[PDB]
Amino acid sequence: VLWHTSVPFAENMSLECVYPSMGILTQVEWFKIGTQQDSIAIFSPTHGMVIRKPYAERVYFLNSTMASNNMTLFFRNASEDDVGYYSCSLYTYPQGTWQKVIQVVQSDSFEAAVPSNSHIVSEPGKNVTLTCQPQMTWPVQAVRWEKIQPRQIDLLTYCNLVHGRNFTSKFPRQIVSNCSHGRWSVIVIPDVTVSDSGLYRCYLQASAGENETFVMRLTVA
Amino acid sequence: VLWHTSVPFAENMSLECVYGILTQVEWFKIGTQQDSIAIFSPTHGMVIRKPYAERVYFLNSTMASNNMTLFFRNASEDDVGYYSCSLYTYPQGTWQKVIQVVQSD
Amino acid sequence: VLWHTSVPFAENMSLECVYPSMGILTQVEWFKIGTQQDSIAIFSPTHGMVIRKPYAERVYFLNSTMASNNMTLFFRNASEDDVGYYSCSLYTYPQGTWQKVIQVVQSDSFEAAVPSNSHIVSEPGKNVTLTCQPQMTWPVQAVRWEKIQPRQIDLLTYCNLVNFTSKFPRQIVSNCSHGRWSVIVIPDVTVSDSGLYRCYLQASAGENETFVMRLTVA
């Protein structure tokens, strides 16, 4: 998993999956994630797209140009059973397999759930350093950084400090994240553009006193 | 296999279960057989099985905090025994916490 | 995730990944699954094989008939660190992904410690039914049917009773629909089917049962 987003449920929701040119694309496959993966569609760069029968009347794709790299999944009339986790799996040569995970949640604008704890104004071209606000004697089990927009959360990184594997987002842009050594608290956004404006959230999952967070608004001139 | 957490019996006892991408959570009672208590999925939500419907509840707080603690609002002598808090993550798989409920307090 | 095949150590060990013919083969990739997914080699049916630098000296593959459905990972040389778990992933169109997990065991431990609890004799051409010996004292979490050979142990059937499909090319008839997990049928048995078979029962919160049976075909 190199890319993890969350989007609100809608009857006409589209699950964005645009792959960066990286080597040769050899196959794409869409899955509904559960304990067992449910295949939605499979794409050949030679023979085209096959939608699995349970989804034949429920999803479609755009007739976008080849160099658009667009595998975005579109729902006709989505229903409550289409809530959950999705996988857009990219198979490339010689780099290998990578996966984008998209979670469909029941939700309003993701900005509405978060009031900013902080505001920073920067200019394009500068690196922007963001920090968590570690507090307690309570051990931090997990740390996660997200970029928040009204229609989309981009999971930038998470560090499991007690158990599990870590995650660092590649795509769409570079996130400087390390996790090791009590510097899970800091990330850098190198060379910001206006499109980097938005809300940035650090969530701290602790042991007994779990669940604390810090939001900061970035505004690029 | 033995237990991870051991608690004494109480009518209002709560069985703590704390803890990526969670695809399924299920509570079982382990005796001579395995009885399902409640099952959760991100698509269907939390669905409690009928034999425990009047016994247990969940305070569905932040699920991203990884908390599925089983609350007894009423508990009887037969709620003593072994419990399993079973967890499936994507694509890693299993994570299981076994909990013992002791009658002697 | 558990394994499909298990083999003992050897510096010339061959981790068999014979796959079925199913649609168009579009890509193959070998990983070593440790605490992290580590890439060994990647194959394109047009561009050929790339072996990642950490395994360039270690491993090699046949350049012969690959159309025989063969991507077996041959070791040229091997150390303690080549012990562990491997993933042989086949990518096909339109069927999708086909994955075989392969276990390499260290201590010089293998079928030498496997005595039978039961012995069945059958003539070739017969449909042989094998059965577990469930004791009905722990709920059965999961069922594994395995074939124990001198050079490899293969998974025949897996059933989680809360998914994992066999990659063994024998066509074992099994269902695990409603208690069916306790039996498997070997149809039209041959002399090559002789050997040790094991039913493995995983308990939810207890100890695991083992029933080993020897089948000898006339």
From Swiss-Prot, chain B:
S-S bonds: C17-C85
Effect recorded for Y90A: Significantly reduced NK-cell killing
Annotated Ig-like C2-type domain residues: 1-103
Glycosylation sites: N12, N60, N67, N74
Locations listed in the record: Cell membrane
Domain of life: Eukaryota
Tissue expression from the record: Expressed by peripheral blood T-lymphocytes.
Function: Cell surface receptor that plays an important role in the immune system, particularly in intercellular adhesion, lymphocyte signaling, cytotoxicity and lymphokine secretion mediated by cytotoxic T-cells and NK cells. Functions as a costimulatory receptor upon recognition of target cells, such as virus-infected or tumor cells. Upon binding to its ligands PVR/CD155 or NECTIN2/CD112 on target cells, promotes the cytotoxic activity of NK cells and CTLs, enhancing their ability to kill these cells.
Assembly: Interacts with PVR and NECTIN2. Competes with PVRIG for NECTIN2-binding. Interacts with ITGAL; this interaction mediates CD226 localization to lipid rafts.
Protein name: CD226 antigen
Species this chain originates from: Homo sapiens (Human)
Interval of the full protein contained in this chain: 21 to 128 of 336
